Amino acid sequence: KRQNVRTLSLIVCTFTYLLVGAAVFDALESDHEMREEEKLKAEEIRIKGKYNISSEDYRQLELVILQSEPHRAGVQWKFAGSFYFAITVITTIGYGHAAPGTDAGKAFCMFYAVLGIPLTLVMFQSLGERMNTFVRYLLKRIKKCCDVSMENMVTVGFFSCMGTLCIGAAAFSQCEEWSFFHAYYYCFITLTTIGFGDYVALQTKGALQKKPLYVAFSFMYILVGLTVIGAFLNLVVLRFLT
Amino acid sequence: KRQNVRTLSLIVCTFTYLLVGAAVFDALESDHEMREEEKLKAEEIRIKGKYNISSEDYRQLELVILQSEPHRAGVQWKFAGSFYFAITVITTIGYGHAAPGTDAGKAFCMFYAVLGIPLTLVMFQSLGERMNTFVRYLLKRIKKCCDVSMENMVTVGFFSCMGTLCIGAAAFSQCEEWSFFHAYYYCFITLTTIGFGDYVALQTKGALQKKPLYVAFSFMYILVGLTVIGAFLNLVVLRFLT
Numbered sequence: 001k002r003q004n005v006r007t008l009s010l011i012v013c014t015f016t017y018l019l020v021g022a023a024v025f026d027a028l029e030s031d032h033e034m035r036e037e038e039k040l041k042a043e044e045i046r047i048k049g050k051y052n053i054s055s056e057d058y059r060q061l062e063l064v065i066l067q068s069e070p071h072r073a074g075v076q077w078k079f080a081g082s083f084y085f086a087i088t089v090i091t092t093i094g095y096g097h098a099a100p101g102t103d104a105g106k107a108f109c110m111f112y113a114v115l116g117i118p119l120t121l122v123m124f125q126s127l128g129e130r131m132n133t134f135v136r137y138l139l140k141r142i143k144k145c146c147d148v149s150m151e152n153m154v155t156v157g158f159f160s161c162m163g164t165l166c167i168g169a170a171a172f173s174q175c176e177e178w179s180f181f182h183a184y185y186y187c188f189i190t191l192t193t194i195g196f197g198d199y200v201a202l203q204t205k206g207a208l209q210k211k212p213l214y215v216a217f218s219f220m221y222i223l224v225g226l227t228v229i230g231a232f233l234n235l236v237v238l239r240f241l242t
Numbered sequence: 243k244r245q246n247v248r249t250l251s252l253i254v255c256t257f258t259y260l261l262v263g264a265a266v267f268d269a270l271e272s273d274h275e276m277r278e279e280e281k282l283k284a285e286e287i288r289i290k291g292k293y294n295i296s297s298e299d300y301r302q303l304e305l306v307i308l309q310s311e312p313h314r315a316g317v318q319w320k321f322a323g324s325f326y327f328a329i330t331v332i333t334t335i336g337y338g339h340a341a342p343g344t345d346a347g348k349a350f351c352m353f354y355a356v357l358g359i360p361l362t363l364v365m366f367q368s369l370g371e372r373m374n375t376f377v378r379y380l381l382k383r384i385k386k387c388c389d390v391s392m393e394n395m396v397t398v399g400f401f402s403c404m405g406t407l408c409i410g411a412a413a414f415s416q417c418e419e420w421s422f423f424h425a426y427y428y429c430f431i432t433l434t435t436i437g438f439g440d441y442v443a444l445q446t447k448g449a450l451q452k453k454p455l456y457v458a459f460s461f462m463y464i465l466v467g468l469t470v471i472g473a474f475l476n477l478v479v480l481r482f483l484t
C-alpha cells in the first residue's frame with residue numbers, strides 16, 4: 001500500500017544519505033587523522049625515550065590520567081554537579097563528563113531517565129506550543145500596527161533560532177574564552193541533544209562552585225534553546241508524523 | 243486556562259524531580275568521588291616522585307594521552323568508522339569517541355545533522371507504527387488460536403523491550419567480554435539516545451576492520467532497538483502529545 005512504499009522510500013533515502021555522509025567524512029578526515037596519529041606517536045616516542053619510562057608503567061599512567069580527567073575540573077558530584085548531571089540525563093544530551101561508578105547509582109540513573117524522559121518531552125512540547133501561539137499573536141499585532149501564512153511563521157522561527165544560536169555563541173565565547181565558530185558549534189550540538197562531549201561548559205577553574213550566576217544563565221539558556229527547538233520541530237516536523 | 247495550569251504543573255513536577263535526583267546523586271556519589279580523587283592523587287604523586295617527571299612535561303604527557311586516546315582503538319575514520327560516526331550523528335546518540343578536527347568538517351556535520359534528523363525521526367515513527375500493527379495482528383491470531391485491550395498491548399510492548407534488552411546485553415557480554423549488568427546498562431544507554439560514551443562498542447583490537455559480521459550485527463541490533471523504542475513511545479507517550 002501507500003504506507004509500505006513510503007517507508008521503503010524513507011529507508012532507501014536514509015541508507016543513501018548515510019553512505020554519502022560516510023564517504024564525505026572519510027575523504028575529509030582520513031589524511032588529518034593519519035597526520036595526527038603520526039605526530040602523536042612521534043611525540044610519545046620522543047618523551048618515552050627521553051624519560052626512559054617503563055612500558056608496564058606507561059599503561060598505569062594512561063589509566064590514571066584517563067580516570068583523573070574529570071577530577072581536574074573540580075568536584076563534579078556536588079549540588080551543582082548533580083543538578084547538571086540530572087539535567088543532561090533528562091534531556092538525553094549525554095555529555096559524558098561525569099558518570100556513575102556504582103551499580104546502584106547506575107540503576108537509579110536508568111530508572112530516573114525512564115521516569116523523566118516522557119515528562120520532559122511533554123513539558124517541552126507544551127512550552128513550544130505556547131511559544132508558537134505567543135509568536136503568532138505578536139506577529140498579528142505587529143502586522144496590525146504596520147491573516148498570517150505558514151511561510152511567515154517558518155521564517156520567523158528560523159530567524160529566532162539563528163538569533164538564539166548567535167546570542168549563545170557570543171555569550172559562550174565571552175565567558176569560556178572560546179572561538180566564535182567553536183562556540184556556535186558547541187551551542188548547536190547542545191541544542192540538538194547530541195552531546196559529543198568535546199566541548200563542555202562549567203568545567204574551567206571550578207566555575208560550578210564559584211560562579212552561581214553563570215550556572216544559572218547556562219541553565220536558562222539551555223532551557224530556552226530546547227524550548228525553541230521543540231517549537232520549531234512542532235511547527236515543521238510534527239506535521240509529518242500523524 | 244487549562245493549558246496554563248497543566249504546563250505550570252509540568253514545570254513544577256520537573257523542577258521537584260530534578261531537585262530530588264540531584265540530592266540522591268550527590269548523597270550516593272560524593273564519598274566515592276572523594277575516595278577516587280584521593281587514590282588517584284596518591285598514585286600520581288608516587289609515580290611523579292619515582293620518575294622525577296618535570297611539572298611542565300606532565301601537562302604535555304596529559305595532552306598527548308588525551309588526544310591519542312581514540313587512535314589507540316585503530317583507524318576511526320575509515321569506511322566503517324565514518325559509517326558509525328554518521329549513524330551516531332543521525333540518531334542523536336553522541337558517543338564522542340571520534341570528533342571532527344576541521345572547521346569545514348564541523349560545518350558539514352552540522353548540516354548533515356540538520357538535514358538528517360527529521361528524516362530519521364519520520365522513518366522510525368513509520369517503522370514503529372508498522373511494527374505495532376504487525377504485533378496487533380499477531381496477538382489477534384494467537385488469541386484466535388487459543389478484541390484486544392490497550393493494557394495487553396502495553397504489556398506486550400514492555401515484554402518485547404525487556405527481551406530485546408536482555409538479548410543485546412547477553413550478546414555484548416559474550417562479544418566484548420563485559421559484565422551482564424554493564425552490558426545491560428550500555429544497551430539501555432544506547433537505546434535511549436543518551437550516549438554517555440563510557441562504554442563504546444567496536445573499539446577493541448580493531449574490530450571495525452577485522453569483524454564485518456560483528457559490525458553488521460551491532461548496526462542491526464541498534465536499528466531494531468531504536469525501532470522498538472519508537473514503537474513503545476508511540477504506543478504510550480505520543481497519545482499525550484496532541
Ligand SMILES: CC(C)CCC[C@@H](C)[C@H]1CC[C@H]2[C@@H]3CC=C4C[C@@H](OC(=O)CCC(=O)O)CC[C@]4(C)[C@H]3CC[C@]12C
Pocket residue numbers: 171175211213214217
Ligand atoms: C534582547 C536580546 C537581543 C538580548 C538579550 C540580552 C543578553 C545580551 C543578556 C541577557 C542575559 C545575559 C547574561 C546573564 C548572565 C551572565 C553571567 C555573567 O557572569 C558573571 O558576571 C561572572 C563571570 C565573570 O566574571 O565574567 C557574565 C555575563 C552573562 C553571560 C550575561 C551576558 C549577556 C546576556 C546574555
Ligand SMILES: CC(C)CCC[C@@H](C)[C@H]1CC[C@H]2[C@@H]3CC=C4C[C@@H](OC(=O)CCC(=O)O)CC[C@]4(C)[C@H]3CC[C@]12C
Pocket residue numbers: 079080083208209210212213215216217219220
Ligand atoms: C520560572 C522559571 C524561570 C524559574 C527558574 C528557576 C531558576 C531561577 C533556578 C532553577 C535552578 C537554579 C540553580 C540550581 C543550582 C544552583 C547551584 C547553587 O550552588 C550552590 O548552592 C553552591 C555554590 C554557592 O555557594 O553559591 C547556586 C544556585 C544555582 C545556580 C541555582 C540558581 C537558580 C536556578 C537557575
Ligand SMILES: CC(C)CCC[C@@H](C)[C@H]1CC[C@H]2[C@@H]3CC=C4C[C@@H](OC(=O)CCC(=O)O)CC[C@]4(C)[C@H]3CC[C@]12C
Pocket residue numbers: 114115118119122244247248251252255478479482
Ligand atoms: C514507561 C514510561 C514511558 C512511562 C512514562 C510515564 C508517563 C505516561 C507520565 C509521566 C509524567 C506524566 C505527566 C505528568 C503531569 C501531567 C500534568 C497533568 O495536568 C493536570 O493534572 C492539570 C490539567 C488537567 O486538568 O488535565 C496532565 C497529565 C500529565 C501531562 C502527565 C501525563 C502522563 C505522564 C507523561
Ligand SMILES: CC(C)CCC[C@@H](C)[C@H]1CC[C@H]2[C@@H]3CC=C4C[C@@H](OC(=O)CCC(=O)O)CC[C@]4(C)[C@H]3CC[C@]12C
Pocket residue numbers: 002005006009010013236237240356357360361364
Ligand atoms: C529545517 C529542517 C527541519 C528541514 C527538515 C526536512 C523535512 C521537512 C523533510 C526531510 C525528509 C523528508 C521526508 C523524506 C521522504 C518522504 C517520503 C515521501 O513519500 C513518498 O514520496 C511516497 C508516498 C506518497 O506518494 O506520498 C513523503 C514525504 C517524506 C515523508 C518527506 C517529508 C519531508 C521531510 C521530513
Ligand SMILES: CC(C)CCC[C@@H](C)[C@H]1CC[C@H]2[C@@H]3CC=C4C[C@@H](OC(=O)CCC(=O)O)CC[C@]4(C)[C@H]3CC[C@]12C
Pocket residue numbers: 413417453455456459
Ligand atoms: C528468537 C530469539 C529469542 C533469538 C534471536 C537469535 C539470537 C540468539 C542471534 C541472532 C543474531 C545473532 C548474532 C549475529 C552475529 C554475531 C557475530 C558473531 O561474531 C563472529 O562470528 C566474530 C567474532 C567471534 O569470533 O566471536 C558472534 C555471534 C553474534 C553476536 C550472534 C549471536 C546470537 C544472535 C544474537
Ligand SMILES: CC(C)CCC[C@@H](C)[C@H]1CC[C@H]2[C@@H]3CC=C4C[C@@H](OC(=O)CCC(=O)O)CC[C@]4(C)[C@H]3CC[C@]12C
Pocket residue numbers: 321322325450451452454455457458459461462
Ligand atoms: C532490509 C535491511 C535489513 C537492509 C540492511 C542492510 C545491511 C545488510 C547493510 C547496511 C550497512 C552495512 C554495513 C556497512 C559497513 C560495513 C563495513 C564494511 O567494512 C569494510 O568494507 C572494511 C572491512 C573489510 O574488508 O571487510 C564491511 C561491511 C559492513 C559491516 C556492512 C555490512 C552490511 C550492512 C549491515
Ligand SMILES: [K+]
Pocket residue numbers: 092093094095194195196335336337436437438
Ligand atoms: K551524547
Ligand SMILES: [K+]
Pocket residue numbers: 094095096195196197336337338437438439
Ligand atoms: K558523549
Ligand SMILES: [K+]
Pocket residue numbers: 095096097196197337338339438439
Ligand atoms: K566522552
Ligand SMILES: [K+]
Pocket residue numbers: 091092093192193194333334335434435436
Ligand atoms: K538525544
Ligand SMILES: [K+]
Pocket residue numbers: 092093094193194195334335336435436437
Ligand atoms: K544524546
